[PDB]
Design a protein around this nucleic acid. Structure first.
Lengths: 196, 423, 55, 196, 423, 55
DNA sequence: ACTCGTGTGAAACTTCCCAAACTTTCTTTCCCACAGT
DNA sequence: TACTGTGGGAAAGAAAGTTTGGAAAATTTCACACGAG
């Protein structure tokens, strides 16, 4: 711990993308699930830093908690989904990360991916379990966050695996509504008229 | 007049000024339902403060343009939103705070949660936008529940700020809340303060050096309370339940929301803390003959207790009047460092983000990728944006991070990026 | 480089492109959107002003 | 597959104890759960060959099935237990191998460890779950195999965790009996008089 | 005379001779319980063969020492073991095989499984030791069970060798089993053959090119049966259930143990396979009028079918007479190669191992570590133990692996280690 | 070597030592153990020989 | 019954898979005394 | 007065549970009657 950020020698090599620097630190039976003051394991750092090199190491390593949370309870599967990086989401899925794991606001990577209109993510995530109608501690279906943010493409995709468009939020507003409101008439037209 | 993006200049003359406007809604975490024709009011009343040495600047600048004492009058309205009841005005005249003591929630409001929206504008129709409270939970009745922490949301946990009020014999008008006037605790029917409910050890050392604990709060525990308002603290108290003005000493259950109770001052005989039909004092509590460990107690040592919340929002005008509301106001929970050095970025998680912001590192605007409502991303600008010499970060530099709108409204953050030499 | 650089150029472009499409809808709708906010700040101001007329 | 034995490039480096030869074969996304004609994954080869170097690699790697079986359904945890190697048993246990997993004759590594009077193995195994009273498709308690082979020390150890000495075989012989018969009077005296 | 460990010599003059003695117990996988005073016999009778061109050598060597025709008489006794019934002799006189057709299992034998032990010695009291059958399971009554494969042990699976017998009208003495006499299928009341019950496709090509399937066997399937004894095969048959000499064509349940059935010769009209009060033929089967798909059938086309097992044991005298029994006899299921080259060892998994053995690679004895009963270990001797030149294995060499006891009894294995040049 | 060699010497010894203790109980008990096998092959031979006397 | 392998098949019986009140700790509703306008 | 909040209780309910019945295959075991020496 450099005690500035609470970060370990591993954490650093993760963020700095030193892919084999990390390797010897693993030859050393060095724990790869240490938390910095943000409460993130070097894997988190690795994802955050789009460091495919180091990433690959940690996930190929069995010791490493793939579903580790941060102080706000973010999983690497979450960052992976929002920070729009290539591959990572998938690799974590294949290595059997809890796809329905949630952060403190109880949003799943599917949720976030619909927040950041991350269509690719959402599809992969759907085809790997993923509660498509999960709620968060505001009773928000990920179809909802989509319809709020108005991210239409990801939206078509859950409408596509038939997400339930009628599950509301914790204030009895349909997703259909937070559209109307935020003035996304497209997302509306889609909710009014696509599938059923 | 077309909208003017804030300038390298306007900024550096805000890091000197810091003449912030700032709203500040206080309010309870729960609200009792109101079945049929009745009307249960929110029993600490949602209390819209209005801090910041810059509201004045806005009265000044306004009138110095041709504006009434009637015009530069901030004009607020509160409301639960989603109703035919319409909204209710607040009298922000004279004093800067205000309270809405006749707010309720019909039987014809199915929603098992809700939010207070505090609409606002200057008299001149000049808009300032809607402000939102931090989520409130309908209940049906104060839930007297033994040790199953199943709902958890209802249990008053340690550390949380709570406000407690006293009403008497069952009459609407008497209501008086433990508030602090300058440094002397009283019971206003206008003002209520919010105190932190820190937990303590059963066995005790001196009355200072206050070391805190974890977990929920159960009746019987020892709990000091520090006011965020004056900073002051009351002597070490012991919370115990109450049934028909009798304070049962052996209550082993956890304090649920909106529960009547009483505060035994530790080591003061059998004295408790009690409401004064005036300025607040202590009381001896009656005998306890037929019921052994169950003391009978006064009208005034019987408080109702509710966990509270605040909803702050700061924002400065950095390019003068702007036609559209300054709202929604960006609030920034956490600031993450993605990557390092020459690639270094920064992810911002908060809420109410909008594509039309741009995070500024001190006076240097940084390119800003908006991911969504509650996440943003920006590129840590090179160190030679501040110290014009150096191609590298030769030693620690710390600038304050801040969000800045298009028409240059600037939402402050009090969060600071700190450059550091590479390890 | 170009191994990673082409990858990083591609990532940043995603955010970039995205951010664009967002900050462009928000701007476009905001007229129509400010409009249930004006019409509302209006027949509500004619109440701010006659409770000033009761002083 | 060299098709002589059905063995892969990995299998080989495992058996030959080329500890970093294995490493590059893993950099290559080469599957580490290939079966040779005996039906053994390279890990099985690594254990068999007391090759701590390679072993450590494969087990530290997440992909690798730690509970893989052979044509006779032997788990590495099984060989580990019988082939009397140092450490391996433990490291596999720590990496969360199914400790109660069984071969086709339905004998657990605790069973074998009692067959081969492998006291150490038995103890580690007991303190990690391990059904101490498990039976095999001959209804043989591992306390039994001990009392058959007459391996007394391992026996004292199950009697120590109170294995049930009354569970019989699938022919209603007490372990107490197969002792008597095989002329292990010590194992008898112990079963007659130690604990209860 | 003190015991003589086998020698480098004795061996090389066995890899030429190969004059093996060998027992060989055949027997049914199940045996029906016998409640109280009754006596259900093992309905194929356990059949102690005695192959190997060296039982003769042991008659020869013996008499050529001063031994009776009475003395060099192998003298066997069978038994379920654990009883007061004592044992029952076998008449190994004349012919080399024998059968024990009055063996049963009391109600006073609680054991839910059991084993046949075949004691033996030469007439001279000269011992040869106990031989054991491959585990047999008590049942209470042939279990007519629909498609739940819960017990599995009872369900006749594909590939397994099965013997089927015919008894008639309910009388003990008639019993005749499908056996092969030289190449012509008959029904002996002395001899029973064991046939493999391979599974086939519902839709069919020609009557050869026999390609097999997996899973259990259900009534109605097509099943060829090849004899291990003559090698011969019966035409493609169709197994169907039987109730009161009527062969229900639509039986969709799986063949359970000790079940009556019948074999429809495919594509031969309505002909089946039937018992001849002589040498075996086919039968047309009666009408089927009131019951539509349910054909009435003969006494002789109604067989009982049971899954069987063998228990082989070879062993040579490599140092002449040995005082103690040549039993228990080492049998070797699998041979594993631990390690490589200069460290190369070999693990042997089998059963009835004993510390007093030592695995020989051809004629070179290799150091042998005994791990336990069912596992052993030995050190692959250097290639220069066979090819005296070379420090390395310059190209493929294959020697046969074999277990050798202390007093040089030698148990063969038909398993072979093959040296190979390093890859 | 000696890293592994001392480890391998140690392993082999274990088997070696074990096998020793085994092959030495077995040998030791075998007299007494052959003894319910003789006494049995006896009063059972006096039955092998009088069913030869019935031919 | 004369006494002994076989098969009926009826009567006792085993885990077993699944469908019921309630053990039951929580709510949500509504119905109604008491004190101040 | 007769209508304002309020506390408060009592009858109405409800989703997490343990489990009690007991209805659905497949054991045991036993008592028994053909056909043969």
């Amino acid at each position: 711990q450099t005690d500035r950020t609470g970060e370990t020698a591993l954490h650093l090599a993760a963020r700095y993308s030193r892919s084999d620097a990390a390797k010897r630190l693993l030859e050393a039976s060095a724990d790869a699930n240490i938390q910095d003051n943000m409460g993130r394991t070097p894997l988190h750092a690795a994802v955050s830093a789009d460091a495919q090199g180091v990433f690959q190491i940690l996930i190929r390593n069995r010791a490493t908690d793939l579903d580790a949370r941060m102080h706000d309870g973010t999983t690497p599967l979450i960052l992976a989904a929002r920070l729009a990086v290539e591959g990572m989401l998938e690799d974590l899925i294949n290595s059997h990360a809890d796809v329905n794991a949630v952060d403190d606001l109880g949003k799943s990577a599917l949720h976030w991916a619909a927040a950041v209109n991350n269509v690719d993510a959402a599809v992969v995530l759907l085809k790997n379990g993923a509660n498509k109608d999960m709620q968060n501690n505001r009773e928000e279906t990920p179809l909802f966050l989509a319809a709020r943010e108005g991210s239409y493409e990801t939206a078509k995709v859950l409408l596509d695996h038939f997400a339930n468009r009628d599950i509301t939020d914790h204030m009895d507003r349909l997703p259909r509504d937070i559209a109307q409101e935020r003035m996304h008439h497209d997302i509306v037209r889609l909710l009014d008229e696509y599938n059923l | 007049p077309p909208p003017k993006r804030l300038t390298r200049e306007a900024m550096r003359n805000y890091l000197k000024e810091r003449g912030d406007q700032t709203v500040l809604i206080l309010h309870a975490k729960v609200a009792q339902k109101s079945y049929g024709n009745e009307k249960r009011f929110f029993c600490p009343p949602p209390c819209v403060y209005l801090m910041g040495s810059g509201w004045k600047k806005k009265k000044e600048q306004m009138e110095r343009d041709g504006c009434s004492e009637q015009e530069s009058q901030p004009c607020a309205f509160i409301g639960i939103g989603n109703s035919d009841q319409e909204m209710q005005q607040l009298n922000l005249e004279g004093k800067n705070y205000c309270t809405a003591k006749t707010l309720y929630i019909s039987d014809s409001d199915k929603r098992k949660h809700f939010m207070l929206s505090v609409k606002m504008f200057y008299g001149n129709s000049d808009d300032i936008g809607v402000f939102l409270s931090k989520r409130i939970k309908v209940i049906s009745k104060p839930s007297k529940k033994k040790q199953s922490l199943k709902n958890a949301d209802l249990c008053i946990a340690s550390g949380t700020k709570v406000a407690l009020f006293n009403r008497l014999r069952s009459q609407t008008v008497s209501t008086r809340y433990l508030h602090v006037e300058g440094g002397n605790f009283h019971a206003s029917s206008q003002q209520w303060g919010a105190f932190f409910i820190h937990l303590l050890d059963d066995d005790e050392s001196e009355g200072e050096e206050f070391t805190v604990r974890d977990g929920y709060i159960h009746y019987g525990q020892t709990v000091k309370l520090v006011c965020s308002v004056t900073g002051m603290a009351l002597p070490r108290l012991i919370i115990r339940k109450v049934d028909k003005q009798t304070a049962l000493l052996d209550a082993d259950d956890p304090v649920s929301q909106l529960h009547k109770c009483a505060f035994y001052l530790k080591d003061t005989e059998r004295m408790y803390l009690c409401l004064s039909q005036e300025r607040i004092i202590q009381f001896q509590a009656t005998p306890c003959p037929k019921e052994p460990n169950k003391e009978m107690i006064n009208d005034g040592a019987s408080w109702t207790i509710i966990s509270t919340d605040k909803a702050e929002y700061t924002f400065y005008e950095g390019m003068g009047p702007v036609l559209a509301p300054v709202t929604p106001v960006p609030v920034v929970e956490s600031l993450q460092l993605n990557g390092g050095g020459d690639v270094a970025m920064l992810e911002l998680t908060g809420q109410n983000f909008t594509p039309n912001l741009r995070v500024w590192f001190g006076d240097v605007e940084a390119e800003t990728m908006y991911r969504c409502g509650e996440s943003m991303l920006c590129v840590v600008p090179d160190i030679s944006a501040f110290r014009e010499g150096w191609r590298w970060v030769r030693q620690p530099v710390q600038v304050p991070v801040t969000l800045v709108r298009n028409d240059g409204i600037i939402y402050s953050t009090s969060l600071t990026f700190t450059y550091t030499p590479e390890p | 480089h170009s191994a990673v650089m082409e990858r990083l150029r591609r990532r940043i472009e995603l955010c970039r492109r995205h951010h664009s499409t967002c900050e462009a809808r928000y701007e476009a709708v905001s007229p129509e959107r400010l409009e249930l906010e004006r019409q509302h700040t209006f027949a509500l101001h004619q109440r701010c002003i006659q409770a000033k007329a009761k002083r």
